[PDB]
Symmetry: C2
Subunit: 235 residues, 2 copies
């Protein structure tokens, strides 16, 4: 299964900053049949970003409507390949597990690929981690039609605490067993589970080495040149 | 006051349908020094739309974040960097489906005006509110939530959305609309002064079609429209024509 590294630029960038940053990304020699690399710019930067990045990179948008909203139909029509669903920022705009299920159903009926985010809070980590994550995942997992095309992301919302690569691997493990339980062992073995906590050039190798971590959804470190080194950890 | 006609495409369009629609719009001869016509396409259609439209049309986006730069949001800063001239704030759909509050509207307007954007600011009362004689109460509270932020009164445009006559069965008439706009205008007179109240554009944001536009625009305190699905049509040109 293909490792997958994603740049979530969140609400950042200017037309010049994107030219320079996409240029440095372009400089990276990687094989896209080996490794998926996905850039998620702000909506109004999408066409600019998609033009500038080479075809070896995929692109997506950071949210999609279950119905100011970008509909899945509109994304389909523009050849926009990926959408992010359920990012904790969106949940903390009050997005619920039901909204996440319903966005995924909308995206999948339109031939979109989805990067779906979940994970447990500090308080829930009352030893409620597998419970919280089993509920979050069961809320949408039955919708998955092709297990190459839905990418899960564990976001350790649990603050002044840091997650170790061991603690990440343990939650990945249990997500892939939730999937195995709920959908089958071959499905679980197919699905990419990315780490979506704090990822930088210094801890990325320790995480990608982990048996159940297949890449990353990267926030602030993906606004820098050196994001190419996070990609290189996955090469 | 120049009249002001806005096309809110809401969640609609493809690339070819936009090429076709923008071509029809470009065929209309109006004087943009006498009439403001603003198109608000979906975010991912903005670049395409702005290229296809002639300069007589202004453009904008349908929502803006209250947070600056720092998932899913377009900041006022990013908009200003893209030379996006207008934003829509407070549309009923955002108040309904995203829980947008009067506080969010104020902060969005604050972020917008600090970044040199012009703002189309929507408000309006529900059926239940109107039935309890709360029209004036609710509109006063909604307008007072942001009205002290307005500097140049050409650069903020108010929109009355009669939620009570949107998907309720109920229809509003032009007299009913005019009465509300007059009340809105006195709110602005009472809070910012006579000159500012007579400068500000107040649009009707209820159901606007080829059928009703002229009945609406002719009322004294109705200065235009924020038009939804009727703006996804070539005959949007005839709505503009009533304001010409
Ligand atoms: Na791995
Ligand atoms: Na009038």
């Amino acid at each position: 299964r293909k490792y997958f590294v994603a740049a979530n630029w969140k609400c950042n960038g200017t037309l010049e900053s994107i030219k320079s940053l996409t240029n440095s990304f372009n400089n990276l020699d990687f094989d896209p049949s080996k490794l998926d690399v996905v850039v998620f710019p702000v909506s109004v930067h999408y066409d600019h970003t998609r033009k500038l990045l080479q075809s070896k990179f995929s692109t997506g948008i950071q949210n999609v409507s279950k119905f100011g909203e970008v509909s899945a139909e509109i994304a389909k029509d523009l050849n926009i390949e990926y959408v992010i669903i359920g990012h904790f920022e969106r949940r903390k705009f009050h997005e619920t597990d039901e909204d996440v299920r319903e966005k995924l159903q909308a995206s999948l009926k339109n031939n979109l690929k989805a990067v779906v985010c979940f994970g447990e809070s500090l308080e829930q980590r009352q030893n409620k981690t597998i419970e919280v994550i089993t509920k979050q995942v069961k809320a949408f997992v039955d919708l998955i039609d092709n297990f190459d095309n839905v990418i899960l992301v564990y976001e350790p919302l649990w603050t002044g605490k840091t997650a170790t690569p061991e603690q990440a691997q343990l939650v990945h493990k249990e997500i892939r067993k939730i999937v195995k339980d709920t959908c089958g062992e071959k499905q679980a073995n197919q699905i990419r589970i990315l780490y979506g906590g704090s990822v930088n050039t210094e801890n990325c190798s320790s995480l990608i080495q982990q048996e159940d971590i297949d890449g990353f959804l990267v926030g602030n470190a993906s606004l820098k040149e050196s994001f190419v080194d996070i990609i290189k950890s996955a090469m």
